[PDB]
Design a binder for this molecule. Structure first.
Ligand code: HEM
Length: 153
């Protein structure tokens, strides 16, 4: 599970991430499209922004950019006693958005790499995994719920 040693560590860099929600976020976005162009069309808000440049260019997309952080800003803080947060994601994302855990794993991986560029030395040989176990718990507690959801797969 998550050791008392990295729960400040995975929440440390999210403290040091508390700095910019959008900038790291306007990034956690792109590696989800630029490694995965599909999650784009999957995000019908914007399917209409093809080119890479206009990305930091758009102001609204940035509107959504904090949201996820604010989710992680609610999620990560719980530290696994998060349960309060998980239903609303489990639902809007399964039923209304139709985005599976692998996209929400694509995003974890977007986030994960997106923290690498902004945070170099800040990123530990200990932080890498704290991100996963911290993500894998978020990813683990929704995919199990698509079972109470019937939308998993
Ligand atoms: C860090 C991972 C994720 C978190 C915390 C997150 C969080 C959120 C939140 C808080 C909202 C707005 C609430 C609403 O109106 O229902 C939202 C909306 C949305 N999300 Fe995510 N999301 C995540 C991953 C993804 C992924 C991987 C996709 C794949 C397409 C996605 C697609 C969407 C779409 C299409 C919307 C709808 C926007 C709207 O019209 O309001 N999300 N997400």
């Amino acid at each position: 599970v998550l050791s008392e040693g990295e729960w400040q560590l995975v929440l440390h860099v999210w403290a040091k991430v508390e700095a910019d929600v959008a900038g790291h976020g306007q990034d956690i976005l792109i590696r989800l499209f630029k490694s995965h162009p599909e999650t784009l069309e999957k995000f019908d808000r914007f399917k209409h922004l093809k080119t890479e440049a206009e990305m930091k260019a758009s102001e609204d997309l940035k509107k959504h950019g904090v949201t996820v952080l604010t989710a992680l800003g609610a999620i990560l803080k719980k530290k696994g006693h998060h349960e309060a947060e998980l239903k609303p994601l489990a639902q809007s994302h399964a039923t209304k958005h139709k985005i599976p855990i692998k996209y929400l794993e694509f995003i974890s991986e977007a986030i994960i790499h997106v923290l690498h560029s902004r945070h170099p030395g800040d990123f530990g040989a200990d932080a890498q995994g704290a991100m996963n176990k911290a993500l894998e718990l978020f990813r683990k507690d929704i995919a199990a719920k698509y079972k109470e959801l019937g939308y998993q797969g």
